[PDB]
Structures are given as C-alpha cells and as structure tokens.
C-alpha cells in the first residue's frame, strides 16, 4: 500500500545513474522478503523493474522459516511459465535458492509437483519445470530417469537438452533407475548424436565420457563406432562441444582397453589433437591470462598420456608432423610444434634421443625468439629433456642452455620469467654438482631476479634457490656465494612481520640453504633460531585460546609452525652440535612435545623430523625427555598417516643409536607396531626401508629384546633393504640383524633363503660386516652339514649361488 509505492522509487534509485544514489540506495537496500515477490509475480510497470525485484529477493535466512517460505513458494510454482522468458528463468533461480538453503524440508510437494508439470500442454510450463529440475540435479529423484529418457525424443532443442542434462547427473551415482535402462540411454544418445544443436551435442559427449568410467562393458560392443563420432566432435565448430569431446581421449587412455583399441585410429586422431594444440581467441588475450582448461590444454594432456601409453610406437604417427611444425611456418604453427615436442617427451623419450643433438640446439635458439609465447614453451620443452642435456659433455648442451635460460629468467614478460626460472630449477635438479663451476655466475642472476620479480614469480624463484642449495650441498659454503645470496634473504626476513603468509616460502628456502651452508650459516643462525621458536610458541598459544573459546579467538594458521619447525630442522641438520647452545637456552623441546600432540598430521610430521634431527645434533639435551617422547612416538606408528609414521620410525631408529643398552625399556611400546608396518601390504617403499633400518638399529642395540621376533619380520625386512644400494644405513641395519641372528639363529631358519639373498645384495660391505655375514652363512652350512647345504643352495638362482660361493666361500 505505502511500502510498495516506495518500492517503485527503490528500483528507480537502483536505476538512476548518479553516484550519490549508488551509495545511498546501497545503504537503503540492506535495511522486504515478501513485498518483492509481488512485484515480480503480480505487479503494470516496466519489465526491467519487475525482474530487478527478483535479483534482490534471490539475494535474500530468517525468511525461510518466517511463514513466507510458503507464501512466496505459492507465487512462483503457480507462475513457472510466464509470458516473457526473463521472468520464467528468474523463478527458476528462486525455486533453486529457496530449496538450496541447505536440504530444507518446507517443500514436500516440490519434486512430485514439477515432475507432474512436465506433462503439461503449455510449452513454457513443461520447459519451466525442466529448467528447474536440471538446476536441482546439478546442485531421491532417480525414478524420473525413465521419464527423462522419454523427452530425448519429441520436443524442442531446449527440452531435449535438459533431458540429457538431467540424466547425466546420475551416471556417477550408478543408480538402479538408470543402470537397468542402460541401452535405452545409449541408443537414445546415439539418436541424439546427429542433433544439429551444440548444447545437446556436448551433453551427449559428456554422457559418453562418464559412461567410459562407470559402464565400460556396455560401450565396448560399439567402441570403434563411438571413436569415429568422438573424433568428429573433437573437431566440432563451437569450442565448448569440442572440448567436452576432447575429455574423451584423456579418459579412454586411462582404461587398459585403450592400448589395443586405438592403434587403428592413431593416424586419424593425432593430427586432430595437434591441430587443437594451438591458439587464436586466447592468443590475443595473452598479448593485449586465459582459462585453467581449454581445448589446447586438453589436447596436449591427451597427447602426453597417449605418449605414455604407446611409448615409441607413437613416433611414426607424429615425427612427420613434428618436422612440418618445429621449423617450417611462423609463430603459432611453430609454437605448437614445440609444445608437441614437450608433450611427447616423458612417454616417448628413449625413441627421441637420436633426434636431440639436432633439436636441443634448435630449441636453445628459440629461447630468444622475438615472440614471447615462443620463448615460454621453449623453456618448458627444454626442461622436459634436462636429463639428456645433463648426461652429455657440459660444454655442448648444458653450458649454452644454462647461459640462455639465465637470460630468460630476467627481463621479458612475467610469463617467460616464470617458465624459465621454473625450467632452471629442473636443470639444477638434474645437473647437481655439474653447476659448481658456475655457482657465482648463477647466483648473480637469481639475486637480480629477487629485486625484479613480483610476488607470483618470487615464489618460483624461492624454489629455484632452494633447489640450488639442495642440488649443490656443501659447495654453497664459500664466502663469495654466501655474501651475495644472504643479504636479499635477510632483507625480506626483516621486512616481513610474523603474521605475513609470505613468510612460508622464505623460511622453506632458508631451510634448504642452511643445510647447504654447513657452518657458514653461523653468523646468521641466532635470530633465525629465535624467530622460529617464537612462531611455534605463538601458534600454539593462539590455538590454546581458540580451544578455550572458539567464540572469541581466531584459530591460527598452523603453517607458520610447520614452516618454523622445518627451518629449525634444517638449522639442526646444518649446524649439528653448534645448535647445542641455542637448544639449551630455548624451550623448543617443551614446544616440540605439544607439536607431536597436535591434531594436524603435518605438524606431527615436522616435529618428529626435528626430533630425529636434534637427536643427532645434541642428544645431551634430548635425553631427559626420552621418557616423555617415546610413548608419543609409539602412538604415531600408524600407517594411516604415512609421513608421520615414517618420521616417527626414523626418529626411533636415531634415538636407539644414541642410547645403547639403555633403549631396552622403550622397545615394547614401539616394537609390535613396527613389525606390523613392515608386514603391511601395499606400503610405500620409503616407509618400509625406514622401518627396516629402525628394526635393525633397535635389535643392534638390544638383541635380547628384539631377536625373539626375528621370524616375524626377517622376510619383509630382507625384501625391503634387498633392493637399495650400499650405504652407511643399510650397513647399520644389517649389523643389528646379524647380532640378533647370533642370539636367535632359530628365528631365521624358516625364511633363511631370504637372508642369503639379502647378503648377496651387498657389493662392497665393510670388512667387519663381510665377516659377520661370512661367519653366519658358514655357521648354517656347518649346522646342517655339507650334503644338506648342497641340496639347499642348488635351489638358488645362478648369480646368488655364484656370489655366495666366491665372496663367502660357501
């Protein structure tokens, strides 16, 4: 009556051009949820004003229970097929959002009502409901599937498109209501293939894609027939349908059936993919960022995966094309040839080596093409071959690459920087010690990058500096180098405040760097230490407040803690022994004890890592806490969290070494679970190896305690360490097993063939270890006699039989 007369003035002040009414109507707006629906459903005036009443209504939690959620729902379902198409769709959003506020049950009629409106004579009533039922499916209704299937046939383009759109949201659910009707869907999809409407066509494509992953059995009878269709849809006008069709090849290539099925089509397929791997619309949005997923990337991804499926067999289908692309023609056609060259790379590597001595120099040339987008993928494609470049004499490929790439890191645009700096990290990683001749040279540029780069690329730079430190190790420990790398890092450190998330990459970098610099990091180590402890202390303190009162205290970003703990762990690994003083005066160990308890696996993972690190550096100070830690270590021997388990396991191993016989009381609370982890099927090889060594280290220091269980682990123990090369750690574990064997020889009898193989895996064991092995193997030959021993070792493979003979005289 009076408020509706001011609502004509409310949607005209939201239509008046003035900036004074653009602020005043924004203040008058959020100050209602019943009046609007009357303006849209009933209330004469201009048509934009009737629908702008809908936008502010759909914008509007308190009205969902305030009796109006039965009065508004009255007006919309009654007028779901309005005159203007605008009003009809605005209702569609409104029916969605009213039901979308949770799984609200003020609407028992909803589903059964719209599924009755579908068989209406009035088109806009049928279309209205179907557009509403689709919006629901994308955000119990399975019985509609056979009815949905019926609308595939007769109606407009629109209705058919909703029909296929709805049935699509049930393929993943694998619902009975559709799975019984399999062939009706498939056959109806085929009849909807020829459809001269793109919106329909992509849904048909999308359906056939999900069908690849949910009902492979039904498509196989056709397959070679569906491929011919998908190949045409991949090539379609309208890039939407093309893209959805593309996902096919990516999905298909993930099913074992792919290998033998596609072989015939390859000559037809590949050219089509490669053709889609270039750009045009997106091209101008890059000179004058594009999407996270388009046809180009999908085609590329497909081509990468196929290369991994067919390996070298892919080459004859592609090399021809690659030559026409790499050299011949200009910008875009060329660019795509080099992307193809990188895409192919992982899968068909070996088959392309012959071609590298000619191509990598050619790529090194493109690194300075006058077109940025040619520069960028050149960086990338080159990094896909870093391993070959580094395996050749440094002067021919490495030296010029490292030269040009370094230029590319600087200047150009942000996109070539990114590619080049990330590519250079890949080089560093593969080159390792081969870059020592250039440390000063490299560091010169990366320090300039540090001034030039913006936040996004800065992150990638940090990684390149980190990777450098890791790949070169101690060779970074020279005053020339530390003198240039350290100032820019301290600058950022000082510039950042403890609450700044930009502190994460910096400290993770400074962690890799601190290890590389052994004692060089001493001038810097005090404040770095102190700040980390502060971070951990503050993070836990805030978490305590939140635990006490979530209402009043913001929970912390525990990443400040994960990052501080990883830097303390890199400081400990670097200074080892020199850290002693700092540790003593700080309260890290108390804090670490809270961290080991933290509910976030990452925080536990980081502290156990630090625990083992500090056990090596200054066990003097870790010892008093051993009684407290070991129960928690015991608790965290749980494979559900692989990383935490590994680090706990690692720390135990490290602990035992530091306390000889003294470790005995602590073995029971740890041993059982270690034996369970090693016998566990489908377990990461890193966790198994570490578990293998810890068992070894424990039994070495306390044979009487662990030997009893030698039968339960000897086999998996052997099967694990059996395959890693010779090292100071495998040696330390093998000692422990030897000592345990000469305490419970019985425990080995059953699986003794595995111990023989585990011994034969050694190539240059230390003399003391060589003897333990020798004395054991002989002890067993003597035990059973020569005749029985002859019978037993006759069941060995040749290389085992021969090496045990030669090496151990047995």
């Amino acid at each position: 009556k009076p408020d509706e007369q001011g609502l004509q003035q409310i949607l005209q002040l939201l239509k008046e051009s003035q900036s004074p009414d653009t602020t005043i109507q924004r203040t008058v707006q959020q100050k209602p949820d019943f009046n609007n629906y009357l303006i849209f459903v009933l209330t004469s005036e201009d048509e934009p004003t009737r629908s702008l009443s809908g936008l502010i209504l759909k914008n509007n939690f308190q009205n969902f229970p305030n009796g109006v959620t039965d009065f508004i729902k009255s007006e919309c379902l009654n007028n779901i097929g309005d005159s203007s198409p605008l009003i009809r769709a605005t209702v569609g959003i409104l029916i969605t959002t009213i039901a979308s506020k949770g799984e609200l049950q003020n609407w028992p009629d909803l589903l059964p009502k719209l599924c009755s409106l579908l068989d209406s004579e009035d088109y806009n009533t049928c279309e209205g409901a179907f557009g509403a039922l689709q919006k629901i499916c994308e955000d119990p209704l399975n019985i509609m599937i056979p009815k949905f299937l019926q609308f595939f046939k007769h109606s407009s383009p629109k209705i058919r498109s909703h029909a296929v759109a709805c049935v699509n949201q049930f393929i993943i659910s694998r619902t009975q209501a559709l799975m019984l009707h399999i062939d009706s869907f498939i056959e109806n999809l085929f009849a909807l293939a020829g459809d001269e409407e793109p919106e329909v066509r992509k849904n048909v494509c999308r359906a056939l894609v999900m069908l690849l992953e949910v009902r492979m059995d039904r498509l196989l009878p056709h397959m070679h027939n569906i491929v011919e269709y998908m190949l045409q849809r991949t090539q379609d006008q309208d890039e939407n349908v093309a893209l959805e069709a593309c996902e096919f090849w990516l999905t298909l290539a993930e099913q074992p059936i792919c290998k033998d099925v596609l072989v015939r089509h390859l000559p037809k397929l590949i050219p089509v993919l490669v053709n889609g791997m270039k750009y045009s619309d997106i091209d101008i949005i890059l000179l004058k960022t594009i999407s996270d997923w388009n046809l180009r990337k999908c085609s590329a991804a497909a081509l990468d995966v196929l290369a991994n499926v067919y390996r070298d067999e892919l080459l004859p289908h592609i090399l021809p094309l690659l030559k026409e692309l790499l050299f011949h023609h200009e910008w875009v056609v060329k660019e795509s040839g080099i992307l193809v060259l990188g895409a192919i790379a992982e899968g068909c590597m070996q088959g392309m080596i012959p071609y590298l001595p000619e191509l990598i120099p050619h790529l090194i040339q493109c690194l300075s093409d006058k077109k940025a987008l040619v520069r960028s993928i050149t960086c990338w494609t080159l990094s896909r071959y870093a391993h070959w470049v580094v395996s050749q004499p440094p002067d021919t490929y490495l030296k010029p690459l490292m030269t040009e790439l370094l230029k590319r890191i600087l200047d150009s645009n942000k996109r070539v920087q990114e590619a080049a700096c990330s590519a250079f990290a890949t080089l560093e990683e593969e080159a390792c010690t081969e870059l020592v001749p250039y440390l000063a040279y490299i560091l010169d540029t990366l320090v300039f990058a540090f001034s030039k780069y913006q936040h996004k690329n800065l992150l990638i730079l940090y990684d390149a500096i980190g990777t450098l430190a890791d790949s070169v190790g101690h060779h970074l420990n020279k005053p020339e180098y530390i003198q240039m790398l350290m100032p820019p890092l301290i600058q950022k450190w000082n510039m950042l405040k403890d609450e700044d998330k930009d502190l994460f990459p910096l400290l993770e970098c400074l962690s890799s760097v601190a290890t590389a610099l052994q004692s060089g990091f001493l001038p810097y180590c005090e404040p770095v230490y102190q700040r980390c402890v502060n971070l951990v202390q503050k993070t836990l303190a805030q978490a305590m407040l939140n635990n006490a009162q979530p209402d009043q205290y913001e929970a912390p970003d525990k990443d400040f803690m994960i990052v501080a703990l990883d830097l303390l762990s890199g400081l400990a690994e670097g200074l080892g022994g020199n850290i002693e003083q700092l540790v003593a005066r700080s309260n890290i160990l108390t804090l670490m004890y809270q961290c080991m308890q933290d509910k976030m696996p990452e925080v536990r993972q980081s502290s156990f890592a630090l625990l083992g690190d500090l056990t090596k550096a200054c066990f003097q100070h870790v010892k008093p806490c051993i009684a407290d830690f070991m129960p928690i270590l015991g608790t965290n021997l749980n494979p559900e969290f692989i990383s935490v388990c590994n680090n706990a396991t690692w720390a135990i191993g490290e602990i035992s070494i530091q306390m000889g016989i003294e470790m005995q009381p602590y073995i029971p609370m740890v041993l059982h679970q270690l034996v369970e982890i090693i016998n566990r099927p489908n377990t990461p090889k890193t966790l198994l190896e570490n578990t293998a060594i810890t068992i070894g280290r424990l039994g070495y220091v306390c044979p009487q305690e662990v030997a009893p269980m030698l039968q339960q682990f000897i086999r998996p123990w052997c099967t694990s360490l059996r395959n890693i090369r010779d090292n100071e750690e495998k040696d330390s574990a093998f000692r422990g097993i030897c000592t345990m064997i000469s305490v419970n020889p019985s425990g080995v009898i059953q699986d003794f063939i595995f111990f023989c193989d585990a011994v034969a895996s050694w190539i240059n064991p230390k003399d003391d270890l060589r003897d333990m092995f020798c004395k054991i193997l002989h002890g067993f030959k003597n035990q059973v006699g020569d005749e029985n021993w002859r019978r037993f070792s006759d069941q060995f493979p040749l290389p085992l039989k021969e090496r045990l003979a030669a090496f151990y005289g047995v």
Partner: peptide
Amino acid sequence: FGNYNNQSSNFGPMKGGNFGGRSSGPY
C-alpha cells in the same frame, strides 16, 4: 633372487613441501 634392482636409499625423514612451487606448465 640373485639380480638386484639397484636403487638409491630413501632413508631419513619425509620433509614437507616448500611453500613456493614450480611452474604448473602449459597444461
């Protein structure tokens, strides 16, 4: 047995990812 798939050791802690990262790539 007898022939040993030769491998570098993974002994030691599993250090967490750095908070920088490399280039996601063209695709």
